[PDB]
Design a protein around this motif. Structure first.
Motif, short mmCIF file in Angstrom:
data_model
loop_
_atom_site.label_atom_id
_atom_site.label_comp_id
_atom_site.label_asym_id
_atom_site.label_seq_id
_atom_site.Cartn_x
_atom_site.Cartn_y
_atom_site.Cartn_z
N UNK A 1 2.82 -42.44 9.47
CA UNK A 1 1.70 -42.19 10.37
C UNK A 1 1.46 -40.71 10.60
N UNK A 2 2.53 -39.90 10.61
CA UNK A 2 2.39 -38.46 10.79
C UNK A 2 1.59 -37.83 9.65
N UNK A 3 2.00 -38.10 8.42
CA UNK A 3 1.30 -37.55 7.26
C UNK A 3 -0.09 -38.15 7.10
N UNK A 4 -0.26 -39.43 7.46
CA UNK A 4 -1.60 -40.02 7.44
C UNK A 4 -2.50 -39.31 8.44
N UNK A 5 -1.98 -38.98 9.63
CA UNK A 5 -2.77 -38.25 10.60
C UNK A 5 -3.18 -36.88 10.12
N UNK A 6 -2.26 -36.18 9.44
CA UNK A 6 -2.62 -34.87 8.90
C UNK A 6 -3.67 -34.99 7.78
N UNK A 7 -3.52 -35.99 6.91
CA UNK A 7 -4.53 -36.22 5.88
C UNK A 7 -5.88 -36.59 6.48
N UNK A 8 -5.87 -37.36 7.57
CA UNK A 8 -7.10 -37.73 8.26
C UNK A 8 -7.75 -36.50 8.88
N UNK A 9 -6.94 -35.59 9.41
CA UNK A 9 -7.48 -34.33 9.91
C UNK A 9 -8.16 -33.54 8.79
N UNK A 10 -7.55 -33.51 7.61
CA UNK A 10 -8.16 -32.79 6.49
C UNK A 10 -9.48 -33.43 6.06
N UNK A 11 -9.50 -34.76 5.95
CA UNK A 11 -10.71 -35.47 5.55
C UNK A 11 -11.82 -35.26 6.58
N UNK A 12 -11.47 -35.34 7.86
CA UNK A 12 -12.45 -35.15 8.91
C UNK A 12 -12.95 -33.71 8.96
#
Length: 1289
Positions: A225-236
């Motif tokens: 979930x941590x790395x998914x959140x960081x990837x989601x920040x990048x996509x957003x």
RNA sequence: UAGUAGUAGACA
């Protein structure tokens, strides 16, 4: 001079009639409005509602989308760079071109990948270049975008595009909520997703590293979930970059995670304009993460490798910004859960529970949809309904079922809610999102509350919510019309009598009141008010009825205020200051409140309703009224606020720190009463001992309702006793109440155009439109608009409760019963003290039978459970007014847990700290790095005031500082880093020019925002006075630059000015006239001109102000423009009359600091500033902390307090007659003004000129043992620096 | 069942 109005003569109201009426009413069986909380009852409620729901909503077999973004990660995530983006884009485009499309979206992404891979070298040069060196190209017209001509798209791609591009009756389909197969499928899907997310891929400093870093951060850092959140920040971030006005019309392509996740952005309407969506598709390798294969477009397969192609998602600005900070929202929510678990258990949560809680919070943060928000809003009131003894839980469960279940996430949440509710109704508090059982109800309530606060406030549909906003007002106005047609206007307006109620027995209803009841309640209030008539009269006369109307801040504020009916017929939307200026321009004097009422009494009361934009299931509306309405309401509410301040049972008048103390005292005396023994006297001298017991009633919907008659307040005012000699002011208040009986309710232009667009009209829309005769405004009566008469209605409810108390005392003088009422906010707490038999009550039933057979028939209702009869009579007497107790949101319990939760939620000084914590990462005022950093830091201090542990507050402040540093590029490694240009360390750099803003939460809480700058300047002076070092003096010049910028939140030493993107009376005075007038009149800087002649000029000055004009446009989609220019490093700062970039300002600062020389005038100024800088640092530096062997014990919440010059300075500069008189009017003691000025200037000299004087110019929730001194508050914070251990200071 | 939204017709 108060004009002569008409008074109301008293009626011969007798309490004996009410007592006899109550004797008959309680002579027969009276049903209870609430149901006994059984596990079986809750289970059958759910089981019945399941079949009813299956009937009510058409069955859908395809669960709908809930995930706003789909992606998967298998390795540790590295933040995206430009070179990494290029490499991943090339690799991913090769992979995609190796695949075979199936559906139109697959063909679209194949076409985009083909187009991207075939761009020339100059295209790639301009695609990945900053705006400084960007040059336009045939294919690439904007930096991060390219073009896709329709000739480069196949037929399927164009089919997808036109499907994206392109009623009066329907039924929303829902999944089968009763089928067990559907529930099992939803549970399996969400369980798989959550298990994927949980998959593993200073003294406060040491306490953090031992507790919050160990059991929270070190656990969650390795999760998926941590790395998914960081990837989601990048996509957003990539999606936000494409949302600019110049860019959104083009195509874009980004790749992440070594080419494993690909973003395809389609042309969109820009997010700068309102009501827009950005469209995109994500293509990812199938794996653990945010994957829902049922809602995927396709799954392309290439040699044991599956690529998931998502659907085209249309995300608006609100949800995109929410998705940007999903990781931080989840982290703050899980830290809050961590603190609450530690408090409940006295231990740390295990790794698995922390991981599961974090995954749940992150999934909630990803799925920002209104249905989940509505469900979590319902759960907040559903939980108290099943943990009490009696409540309205059938109504609440029916309301929970009054919705369609469209997605698997909704069904899973429903399944959990049903399980938890049935578990609670059978009892120790099971967790909603874990296997942990709690020991306190507040822990579970905070769990659900944190879940609820993870949804943003604007998820409602705009048109649908705008339509829904007017419905309650229209419906209850129609009900009022029906009542006044059935009974006549006179009976409904003036009330019915007691004999009429005895004859009809149906007059006791909402919007109808009994005159005898109102008079008796007023007499009951006078029984207390008469003994303190002097203080009441002083309070009333202290409202300053003779000062000018518009010379008060509230009358010239920036809030919304309705204007005039326009030629189209709508009500103008205006501002308070505009109407103030207009009235001043159209007359020559400054009238007072009474004089304004005289001048505007003839006009009609008008109001319009606007959206509040909350996260409740139904958004509430805010009423905007006109100026005469505000004058009338000000008179009424000033009068009643003055009166209500002397009544103990009324809590709205309390400041907020006295409210908690008052409620604690009420609970304490209630507990004290139950410790005694009640005895029943008998003729045979044989006493019967009865056991005292308490019942707590948290009564909902007592203050306001669209179902009331404000006309009862007229007789309430007439019969209420004040210490004033005459009835002039009382008659004025009665007249003002008469002038707000009828209202002109306007429908907004948005809803008007919405209905106009329709061709045919449904019956409900037809009935709604019938309320407005001309189609724009209809008349409302009886119902005063929400949030207009709060003290009046609260005091009326208090008087009604006192009337019931007297009536019950007269009914049963042989019983010793205890009553405590607390009419706080819209709710109310009733504490009924009743008596139960001790041993079989063999004499008790015999005594009751003797009473009944002796003629006292009303004793029948006292035989068993007399608190039920108490509530029945109290509810009836409240209904004799127009107060209906809500039968769904009212809980009856023998413990004060649900009430305490509700009361602390209602109090503005005890709102949950997670609500403020989550708000420190959103809605930052977008003007400058320093101001944003200060706004973010101040929100985390408020959270610590509300009860956030220092470790949780430190974590949140670190996250907010990281976000702010990312917004402006200040953090190390980026170009806007000050250390790249200035020859100092980042910690030694001033905050307005980059510089480490990260600080201890203790320094921010005690020493305030800016103490880093203060310490920097102080150390700079010390170095230049004791060492005179070259590079150490370099800091001195940087501060001087800021003053140069400032001269050409508060900032101790200048700032940097940033761009801000943006009237009738703003131009009637020339700007040079304003400058000359402001220069001539300096005392008005600290006071407000009173006389109209110069008050008009003062107000036009207040309009022609960049700070004021920025304030009126705060929430706007164009706010994204500033953050895009700051992220793109454009010309956003002001320097030497030109707009330049931050790097240019930093270079100029470096030049100025290198070329700085001391003149000792700067040294004197800096010494004065340092002297102006409680010495909190020394206390924090000097202290001893050690761990004694003990266990942390948590006590009850306690509110403390943490801790004229303008008149004196204004009196100093007063020259002419008008300024002199204004400063005397404002000043409390004009006689001592000269003495105060003399002593102030003597102190200044021992520590004169106008400039130096011009530049010179908190409630905390703690435990009970803390004192009111700031040292005590700080010591409490230091003792609470460890979550589990006890600290001795 | 393109998304958001909704048992008020929207964005479009």
């Amino acid at each position: 001079y108060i004009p002569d109005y008409k008074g109301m003569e008293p009626i011969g109201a007798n309490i004996e009639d009410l007592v006899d009426y109550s004797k008959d009413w309680l002579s027969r069986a009276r049903n209870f409005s609430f149901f006994e909380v059984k596990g079986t009852a809750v289970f059958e409620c759910f089981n019945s509602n399941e079949a009813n729901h299956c009937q009510r909503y058409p069955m859908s077999r395809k669960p709908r989308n809930f995930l706003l973004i789909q992606c998967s990660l298998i390795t540790s995530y590295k933040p995206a760079t430009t070179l990494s983006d290029q490499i991943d884009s090339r690799r991913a485009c090769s992979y995609i071109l190796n695949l075979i499309p199936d559906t139109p979206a697959s063909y679209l992404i194949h076409d985009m990948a083909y187009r991207y891979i075939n761009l020339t070298r100059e295209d790639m040069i301009n695609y990945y270049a900053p705006r400084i060196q960007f040059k336009q190209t045939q294919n690439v017209r904007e930096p991060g975008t390219f073009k896709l001509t329709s000739s480069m798209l196949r037929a399927e791609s164009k089919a997808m595009l036109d499907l994206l591009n392109n009623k009066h009756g329907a039924q929303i389909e829902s999944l089968n909520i009763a089928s067990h197969i559907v529930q099992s499928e939803s549970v399996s899907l969400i369980t798989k997703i959550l298990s994927d997310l949980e998959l593993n891929i200073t003294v406060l400093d040491k306490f953090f590293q031992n507790e919050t870093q160990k059991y929270l951060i070190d656990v969650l850092k390795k999760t998926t979930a941590w790395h998914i959140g960081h990837l989601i920040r990048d996509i957003t971030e990539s999606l936000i970059a494409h949302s600019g006005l110049k860019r959104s019309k083009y195509w874009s392509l980004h790749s992440y995670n070594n080419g494993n996740v690909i973003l395809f952005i389609l042309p969109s309407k820009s997010l700068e304009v309102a009501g827009s969506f950005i469209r995109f598709i994500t293509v990812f390798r199938i794996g653990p993460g945010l994957v829902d294969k049922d809602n995927l477009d396709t799954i392309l397969i290439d040699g044991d490798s599956q690529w998931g192609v998502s659907k085209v998602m249309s995300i608006d600005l609100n949800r995109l910004l929410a998705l940007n900070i999903a990781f931080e929202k989840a982290l703050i929510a899980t830290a809050t859960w961590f603190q609450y678990y530690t408090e409940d258990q006295g231990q740390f949560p295990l790794q698995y529970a922390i991981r599961s809680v974090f995954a749940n919070h992150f999934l909630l943060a990803i799925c920002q949809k209104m249905k989940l928000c509505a469900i979590f809003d319902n759960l907040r009131y559903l939980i108290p309904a099943v943990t009490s003894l009696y409540s309205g839980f059938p109504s609440l469960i029916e309301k929970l079922f009054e919705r369609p279940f469209k997605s698997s996430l909704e069904v899973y949440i429903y399944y959990n809610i049903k399980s938890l509710l049935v578990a609670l109704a059978q009892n120790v508090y099971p967790s909603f999102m874990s296997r942990i059982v709690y020991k306190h109800y507040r822990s579970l309530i905070s769990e659900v509350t944190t879940c609820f606060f993870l949804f943003e406030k604007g998820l409602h549909g705009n048109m649908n919510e705008e339509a829904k906003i007017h419905l309650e007002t229209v419906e209850w106005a129609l009900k009022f019309r029906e009542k006044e047609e059935k009974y006549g206007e006179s009976l409904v307006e003036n009330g019915y009598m007691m004999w009429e109620l005895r004859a009809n027995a149906e007059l006791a209803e909402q919007q109808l009141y009994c005159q005898d009841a109102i008079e008796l309640a007023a007499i009951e209030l006078n029984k207390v008010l008469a003994t303190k008539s002097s203080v009441v009269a002083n309070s009333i006369l202290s409202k300053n009825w003779e000062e000018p109307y518009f010379s008060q801040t509230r009358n010239i504020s920036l809030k919304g205020m309705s204007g005039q009916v326009q030629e189209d017929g709508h009500l103008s939307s205006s501002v308070t200051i505009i109407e103030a200026i207009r009235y001043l321009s159209n007359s020559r004097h400054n009238p007072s409140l009474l004089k304004l009422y005289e001048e505007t009494r003839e006009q009609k009361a008008m109001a319009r309703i606007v959206r509040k934009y909350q996260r409740t299931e139904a958004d509430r509306g805010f009423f905007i009224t006109t100026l005469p309405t505000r004058c009338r309401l000000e008179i009424i509410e000033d009068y009643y606020d003055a009166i209500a301040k002397n009544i103990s049972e009324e809590y709205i008048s309390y400041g907020g720190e006295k409210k908690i103390l008052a409620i604690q005292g009420a609970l304490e005396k209630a507990l004290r009463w139950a410790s005694g023994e009640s005895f029943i006297e008998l003729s045979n001298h044989k006493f019967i001992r009865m056991k005292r017991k308490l019942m707590y009633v948290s009564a909902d919907a007592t203050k306001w309702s669209p179902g009331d008659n404000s006309a009862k307040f007229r007789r309430f005012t007439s019969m209420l006793h004040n210490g004033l000699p005459n009835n002039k002011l009382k008659n004025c208040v009665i007249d003002a109440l008469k002038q707000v009986y009828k209202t002109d309710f306007f429908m907004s232009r948005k809803l008007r155009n919405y209905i106009d667009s329709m061709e045919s009209l449904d019956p409900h829309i037809k009935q709604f439109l019938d309320f407005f005769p001309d189609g724009h405004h209809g008349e409302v009566k009886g119902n005063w608009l929400q949030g207009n008469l709060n003290k009046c209605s609260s005091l009326f409810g208090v008087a009604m409760s006192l009337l019931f108390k007297q009536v019950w005392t007269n009914l049963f003088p042989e019983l010793d019963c205890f009553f405590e009422f607390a009419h706080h906010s819209d709710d109310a707490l009733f504490i009924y003290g009743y008596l139960e038999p001790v041993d079989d009550g063999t004499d008790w039933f015999l005594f009751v039978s003797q009473q009944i057979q002796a003629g006292h028939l009303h004793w029948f209702s006292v035989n068993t459970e007399m608190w039920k009869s108490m509530f029945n009579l109290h509810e009836h007497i409240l209904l004799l007014g127009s107060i209906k107790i809500s039968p769904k949101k009212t809980t009856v319990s023998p413990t004060n847990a649900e009430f305490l939760s509700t009361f602390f939620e209602g109090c503005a000084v005890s709102i949950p700290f997670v609500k403020i914590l989550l708000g420190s990462l959103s809605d930052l005022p977008g003007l400058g790095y320093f101001d944003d950093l200060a706004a973010a830091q101040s929100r985390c201090v408020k959270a610590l005031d509300l009860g956030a542990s220092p470790q949780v507050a430190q974590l949140a402040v670190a996250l907010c500082t990281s976000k702010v540093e990312r917004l402006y590029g200040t953090a190390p490694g980026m170009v806007n880093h000050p250390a790249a240009y200035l020859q100092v360390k980042h910690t030694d750099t001033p905050i307005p020019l980059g510089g480490n803003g990260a600080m201890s939460i203790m320094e921010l809480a005690t020493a305030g925002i800016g103490m880093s700058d203060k310490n920097l300047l102080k150390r700079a002076l010390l170095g230049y006075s004791h060492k005179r070092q070259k590079s150490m003096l370099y800091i001195l010049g940087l501060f001087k630059f800021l003053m140069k910028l400032s001269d050409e939140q508060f900032s101790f030493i200048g700032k940097v000015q940033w761009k801000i993107f943006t009237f009738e009376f703003a131009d009637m005075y020339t700007s040079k006239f304003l400058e000359l007038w402001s220069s001539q009149h300096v005392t008005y800087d600290y006071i407000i001109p009173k006389g109209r002649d110069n008050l008009l000029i003062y107000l036009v000055r207040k309009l022609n102000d960049p700070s004021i004009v920025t304030a009126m446009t705060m929430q706007s989609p164009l706010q994204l423009r500033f953050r895009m220019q700051a992220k793109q490093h454009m010309k956003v700062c002001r320097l030497d009359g030109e707009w330049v970039t931050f790097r240019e300002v930093l270079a100029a600062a470096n030049s100025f600091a290198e070329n700085y020389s001391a003149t000792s005038q700067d040294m004197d100024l800096f010494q004065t500033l340092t002297s102006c800088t409680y010495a909190w640092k020394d206390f924090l530096n000097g202290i001893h902390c050690d761990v004694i062997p003990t266990k942390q014990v948590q006590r009850a919440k306690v509110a403390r307090t943490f801790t004229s010059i303008p008149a004196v300075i204004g009196y100093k500069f007063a020259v002419t007659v008008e300024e002199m008189s204004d400063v005397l009017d404002t000043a409390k003691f004009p006689d001592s003004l000269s003495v105060d000025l003399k002593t102030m200037k003597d102190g200044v000299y021992r520590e004169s000129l106008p400039d130096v004087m011009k530049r010179i110019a908190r409630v905390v929730i703690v435990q009970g043992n803390v004192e009111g001194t700031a040292e005590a508050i700080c010591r409490y914070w230091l003792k609470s620096m460890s979550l589990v251990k006890t600290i001795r200071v």
